[PDB]
Protein backbone atom coordinates (compact mmCIF):
# COMPACT_ATOMS: atom_id res chain seq x y z
CA UNK A 1 0.00 0.00 0.00
CA UNK A 2 1.15 3.57 -0.89
CA UNK A 3 0.59 4.37 2.86
CA UNK A 4 4.38 4.03 3.04
CA UNK A 5 5.15 5.40 -0.45
CA UNK A 6 6.00 8.83 1.01
CA UNK A 7 7.83 7.49 4.07
CA UNK A 8 9.85 5.16 1.81
CA UNK A 9 10.84 7.94 -0.56
CA UNK A 10 11.82 10.16 2.37
CA UNK A 11 13.76 7.37 3.97
CA UNK A 12 15.45 6.47 0.71
CA UNK A 13 16.41 10.11 0.33
CA UNK A 14 17.97 10.04 3.80
CA UNK A 15 19.85 6.80 3.12
CA UNK A 16 21.24 7.81 -0.25
CA UNK A 17 23.23 10.57 1.42
CA UNK A 18 24.91 8.06 3.72
CA UNK A 19 25.77 5.57 0.92
CA UNK A 20 27.55 8.17 -1.23
CA UNK A 21 31.01 7.28 -2.56
CA UNK A 22 33.70 9.93 -2.60
CA UNK A 23 33.58 11.77 -5.90
CA UNK A 24 37.26 12.23 -6.52
CA UNK A 25 38.12 8.68 -5.45
CA UNK A 26 39.28 7.58 -8.89
CA UNK A 27 41.82 10.44 -9.04
CA UNK A 28 43.28 9.19 -5.69
CA UNK A 29 43.56 5.65 -7.12
CA UNK A 30 47.12 5.17 -8.32
CA UNK A 31 46.57 2.12 -10.48
CA UNK A 32 42.99 2.04 -11.58
CA UNK A 33 41.21 4.47 -13.77
CA UNK A 34 37.70 5.48 -14.80
CA UNK A 35 38.08 3.80 -18.16
CA UNK A 36 38.86 0.45 -16.46
CA UNK A 37 35.89 1.02 -14.21
CA UNK A 38 33.65 1.35 -17.25
CA UNK A 39 35.06 -1.96 -18.51
CA UNK A 40 34.18 -3.63 -15.21
CA UNK A 41 30.65 -2.28 -15.01
CA UNK A 42 30.00 -3.10 -18.60
CA UNK A 43 31.23 -6.61 -17.88
CA UNK A 44 28.85 -6.91 -14.96
CA UNK A 45 25.91 -6.03 -17.21
CA UNK A 46 26.89 -8.95 -19.39
CA UNK A 47 27.11 -11.14 -16.29
CA UNK A 48 23.58 -10.11 -15.36
CA UNK A 49 22.31 -11.14 -18.78
CA UNK A 50 24.09 -14.49 -18.72
CA UNK A 51 22.70 -15.41 -15.31
CA UNK A 52 19.45 -13.51 -15.80
CA UNK A 53 19.93 -11.30 -12.75
CA UNK A 54 17.72 -8.42 -11.72
CA UNK A 55 18.63 -4.91 -12.80
CA UNK A 56 18.68 -3.93 -9.13
CA UNK A 57 21.38 -6.51 -8.42
CA UNK A 58 23.55 -4.77 -11.01
CA UNK A 59 22.79 -1.35 -9.52
CA UNK A 60 23.63 -2.60 -6.01
CA UNK A 61 26.83 -4.24 -7.26
CA UNK A 62 28.10 -0.93 -8.69
CA UNK A 63 27.31 0.95 -5.50
CA UNK A 64 29.39 -1.58 -3.52
CA UNK A 65 32.27 -1.13 -5.93
CA UNK A 66 32.37 2.70 -5.72
CA UNK A 67 32.28 2.64 -1.95
CA UNK A 68 34.89 -0.10 -1.74
CA UNK A 69 37.25 1.76 -4.02
CA UNK A 70 36.70 4.87 -1.93
CA UNK A 71 38.43 3.44 1.13
CA UNK A 72 40.59 0.74 -0.51
CA UNK A 73 43.30 1.12 -3.24
CA UNK A 74 42.94 -1.67 -5.77
CA UNK A 75 45.30 -2.78 -8.55
CA UNK A 76 44.03 -3.51 -12.06
CA UNK A 77 44.92 -7.15 -11.55
CA UNK A 78 42.43 -7.23 -8.76
CA UNK A 79 39.67 -4.88 -9.90
CA UNK A 80 37.77 -7.68 -11.49
CA UNK A 81 37.94 -9.51 -8.18
CA UNK A 82 36.27 -6.59 -6.43
CA UNK A 83 33.52 -6.56 -9.05
CA UNK A 84 32.93 -10.26 -8.95
CA UNK A 85 32.60 -10.22 -5.18
CA UNK A 86 30.28 -7.21 -5.35
CA UNK A 87 27.96 -9.01 -7.79
CA UNK A 88 27.88 -12.00 -5.51
CA UNK A 89 26.97 -9.86 -2.54
CA UNK A 90 24.35 -8.01 -4.57
CA UNK A 91 22.94 -11.34 -5.67
CA UNK A 92 22.82 -12.58 -2.13
CA UNK A 93 20.92 -9.46 -1.00
CA UNK A 94 18.59 -8.91 -3.97
CA UNK A 95 17.88 -12.21 -5.61
CA UNK A 96 15.93 -15.21 -4.65
CA UNK A 97 18.51 -17.85 -5.58
CA UNK A 98 21.92 -16.34 -6.37
CA UNK A 99 24.24 -18.07 -8.82
CA UNK A 100 26.53 -20.52 -6.96
CA UNK A 101 29.95 -19.17 -6.16
CA UNK A 102 31.46 -21.57 -8.71
CA UNK A 103 29.54 -19.69 -11.44
CA UNK A 104 31.03 -16.41 -10.36
CA UNK A 105 34.51 -18.00 -10.61
CA UNK A 106 33.64 -19.30 -14.10
CA UNK A 107 32.64 -15.86 -15.45
CA UNK A 108 36.16 -14.64 -14.82
CA UNK A 109 37.72 -17.56 -16.78
CA UNK A 110 39.19 -18.97 -13.51
CA UNK A 111 41.46 -15.96 -13.17
CA UNK A 112 40.56 -15.86 -9.49
CA UNK A 113 39.94 -18.85 -7.22
CA UNK A 114 36.78 -19.58 -5.29
CA UNK A 115 38.57 -18.89 -2.00
CA UNK A 116 39.70 -15.53 -3.30
CA UNK A 117 36.13 -14.56 -4.37
CA UNK A 118 34.82 -15.58 -0.97
CA UNK A 119 37.43 -13.77 1.00
CA UNK A 120 37.00 -10.60 -1.02
CA UNK A 121 33.29 -10.86 -0.32
CA UNK A 122 34.12 -10.84 3.35
CA UNK A 123 36.46 -7.88 2.75
CA UNK A 124 33.67 -5.92 1.02
CA UNK A 125 31.40 -6.47 3.97
CA UNK A 126 34.10 -5.14 6.38
CA UNK A 127 34.69 -2.00 4.39
CA UNK A 128 31.03 -1.44 3.83
CA UNK A 129 30.10 -2.47 7.39
CA UNK A 130 27.33 -4.65 6.04
CA UNK A 131 25.55 -1.56 4.72
CA UNK A 132 24.11 -3.26 1.66
CA UNK A 133 20.63 -1.69 1.50
CA UNK A 134 21.85 1.13 -0.63
CA UNK A 135 19.33 3.14 -2.58
CA UNK A 136 19.89 3.01 -6.33
CA UNK A 137 18.69 4.80 -9.47
CA UNK A 138 16.56 1.76 -10.20
CA UNK A 139 14.79 2.09 -6.85
CA UNK A 140 14.12 5.77 -7.32
CA UNK A 141 12.83 5.20 -10.86
CA UNK A 142 10.42 2.55 -9.58
CA UNK A 143 9.07 5.07 -7.08
CA UNK A 144 8.76 7.65 -9.82
CA UNK A 145 6.93 5.29 -12.22
CA UNK A 146 3.94 5.32 -9.90
CA UNK A 147 3.42 9.02 -10.81
CA UNK A 148 3.14 8.51 -14.57
CA UNK A 149 -0.09 9.63 -16.30
CA UNK A 150 -0.53 7.30 -18.12
CA UNK A 151 1.71 4.25 -17.44
CA UNK A 152 4.03 4.11 -20.47
CA UNK A 153 6.18 1.00 -20.76
CA UNK A 154 8.51 2.53 -23.37
CA UNK A 155 9.27 5.42 -21.05
CA UNK A 156 9.99 3.03 -18.17
CA UNK A 157 12.33 0.81 -20.16
CA UNK A 158 14.13 3.77 -21.65
CA UNK A 159 14.43 5.41 -18.23
CA UNK A 160 15.95 2.10 -17.02
CA UNK A 161 18.27 2.13 -19.97
CA UNK A 162 19.51 5.63 -19.25
CA UNK A 163 19.93 4.89 -15.54
CA UNK A 164 22.22 1.99 -16.51
CA UNK A 165 24.44 4.08 -18.76
CA UNK A 166 25.07 6.28 -15.75
CA UNK A 167 26.68 3.29 -13.95
CA UNK A 168 29.30 3.04 -16.72
CA UNK A 169 30.82 6.47 -16.35
CA UNK A 170 31.96 7.68 -12.93
CA UNK A 171 33.46 10.64 -14.72
CA UNK A 172 30.36 12.81 -14.53
CA UNK A 173 27.88 10.59 -12.59
CA UNK A 174 29.38 10.07 -9.13
CA UNK A 175 28.73 13.77 -8.39
CA UNK A 176 24.92 13.25 -8.63
CA UNK A 177 22.71 11.32 -6.17
CA UNK A 178 20.79 8.25 -7.30
CA UNK A 179 17.50 10.26 -6.92
CA UNK A 180 18.73 13.04 -9.18
CA UNK A 181 20.03 10.70 -11.88
CA UNK A 182 16.73 8.93 -11.70
CA UNK A 183 14.93 12.26 -12.12
CA UNK A 184 17.06 13.16 -15.14
CA UNK A 185 16.45 9.76 -16.65
CA UNK A 186 12.72 9.83 -16.09
CA UNK A 187 12.53 13.22 -17.79
CA UNK A 188 14.85 12.35 -20.60
CA UNK A 189 13.01 9.13 -21.33
CA UNK A 190 9.66 10.85 -20.98
CA UNK A 191 10.78 13.68 -23.24
CA UNK A 192 12.22 11.21 -25.78
CA UNK A 193 9.09 9.06 -26.11
CA UNK A 194 6.29 11.67 -25.90
CA UNK A 195 7.98 15.07 -25.73
CA UNK A 196 6.55 15.59 -22.26
CA UNK A 197 8.33 16.90 -19.16
CA UNK A 198 9.21 16.11 -15.50
CA UNK A 199 5.71 16.17 -13.99
CA UNK A 200 4.57 18.54 -11.25
CA UNK A 201 3.56 15.45 -9.30
CA UNK A 202 7.25 14.61 -8.96
CA UNK A 203 8.34 18.18 -8.49
CA UNK A 204 6.41 18.29 -5.20
CA UNK A 205 7.21 14.66 -4.27
CA UNK A 206 10.96 15.07 -4.77
CA UNK A 207 11.22 18.83 -4.31
CA UNK A 208 13.35 18.87 -7.44
CA UNK A 209 12.52 21.45 -10.12
CA UNK A 210 13.31 20.69 -13.74
CA UNK A 211 15.92 23.45 -13.50
CA UNK A 212 17.63 21.85 -10.52
CA UNK A 213 17.84 18.66 -12.58
CA UNK A 214 19.34 20.38 -15.58
CA UNK A 215 23.08 19.87 -14.87
CA UNK A 216 22.67 16.09 -14.50
CA UNK A 217 20.24 16.08 -17.40
CA UNK A 218 22.59 17.74 -19.80
CA UNK A 219 25.25 15.19 -18.83
CA UNK A 220 22.78 12.38 -19.36
CA UNK A 221 21.81 13.83 -22.71
CA UNK A 222 25.41 13.83 -23.92
CA UNK A 223 25.79 10.22 -22.81
CA UNK A 224 22.61 9.24 -24.65
CA UNK A 225 23.74 10.93 -27.86
CA UNK A 226 27.26 9.39 -27.65
CA UNK A 227 26.00 5.95 -26.60
CA UNK A 228 26.41 4.27 -29.98
CA UNK A 229 30.11 5.47 -30.12
CA UNK A 230 30.88 4.37 -26.58
CA UNK A 231 33.60 1.84 -26.15
CA UNK A 232 31.38 -0.17 -23.78
CA UNK A 233 28.14 -1.45 -25.32
CA UNK A 234 26.78 -4.23 -23.16
CA UNK A 235 23.94 -1.98 -22.07
CA UNK A 236 22.80 -1.03 -25.60
CA UNK A 237 22.78 -4.76 -26.50
CA UNK A 238 20.68 -5.47 -23.44
CA UNK A 239 17.94 -3.03 -24.21
CA UNK A 240 17.87 -4.05 -27.86
CA UNK A 241 15.85 -7.01 -26.55
CA UNK A 242 12.05 -6.95 -27.03
CA UNK A 243 11.89 -7.52 -23.26
CA UNK A 244 12.51 -3.76 -23.35
CA UNK A 245 10.45 -2.49 -26.33
CA UNK A 246 13.85 -2.02 -28.01
CA UNK A 247 14.10 1.44 -26.56
CA UNK A 248 17.84 1.53 -27.34
CA UNK A 249 16.74 1.82 -30.97
CA UNK A 250 14.59 4.99 -30.48
CA UNK A 251 16.41 8.02 -31.75
CA UNK A 252 17.69 10.41 -29.06
CA UNK A 253 16.44 13.98 -29.47
CA UNK A 254 19.27 16.26 -30.53
CA UNK A 255 18.02 18.99 -28.16
CA UNK A 256 16.58 19.13 -24.66
CA UNK A 257 14.31 22.21 -25.13
CA UNK A 258 15.51 23.75 -21.89
Amino acid sequence: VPDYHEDIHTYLREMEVKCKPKVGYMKKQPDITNSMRAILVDWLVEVGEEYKLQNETLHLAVNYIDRFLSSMSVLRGKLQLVGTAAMLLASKFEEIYPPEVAEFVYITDDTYTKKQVLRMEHLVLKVLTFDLAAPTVNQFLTQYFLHQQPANCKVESLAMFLGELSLIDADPYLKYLPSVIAGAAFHLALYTVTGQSWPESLIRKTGYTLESLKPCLMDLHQTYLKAPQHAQQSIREKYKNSKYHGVSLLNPPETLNL
Partner: peptide, 5 residues
Protein backbone atom coordinates in the same frame (compact mmCIF):
# COMPACT_ATOMS: atom_id res chain seq x y z
CA UNK B 1 36.24 -13.36 -19.49
CA UNK B 2 39.50 -12.20 -17.90
CA UNK B 3 39.47 -8.40 -18.19
CA UNK B 4 42.53 -6.80 -19.89
CA UNK B 5 43.03 -3.43 -18.33
Amino acid sequence: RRLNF
